[PDB]
């Protein structure tokens, strides 16, 4: 079989840099609370 591939490596790097986006967005999310 074939081993290392730079296109697959770049895809994995993009997935790694994209995974924590949802949690950061959730942290910066405004909730339904209005602390007047």
């Amino acid at each position: 079989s074939k081993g290392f591939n730079l296109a697959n490596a770049v895809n994995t790097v993009k997935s790694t840099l994209n995974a924590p986006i949802k949690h950061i967005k959730r942290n910066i999310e405004p909730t339904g609370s209005n602390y007047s």
Binding site: K2, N5, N8, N11, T12
Partner: protein, 57 residues
């Protein structure tokens, strides 16, 4: 029953583990440069034949 389900919910697909994802990525065939295999006469050159041999296997 839980051990048969491997302590995960039946009727839930779940996310593939890294290994599985890796095995979903490494086992896919490599699509070489398609244009090198075309019947164009320009692909009959020695240089183009070498490129096809090394990039398409």
């Amino acid at each position: 029953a839980h051990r048969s389900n491997l302590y995960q919910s039946k009727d839930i697909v779940g996310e593939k583990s890294f290994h599985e994802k890796h095995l979903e990525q490494q086992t896919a065939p490599y699509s070489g440069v398609k244009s090198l295999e075309e019947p164009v006469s320009q692909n009959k050159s020695f240089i183009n034949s070498l490129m096809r041999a090394i990039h398409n296997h």
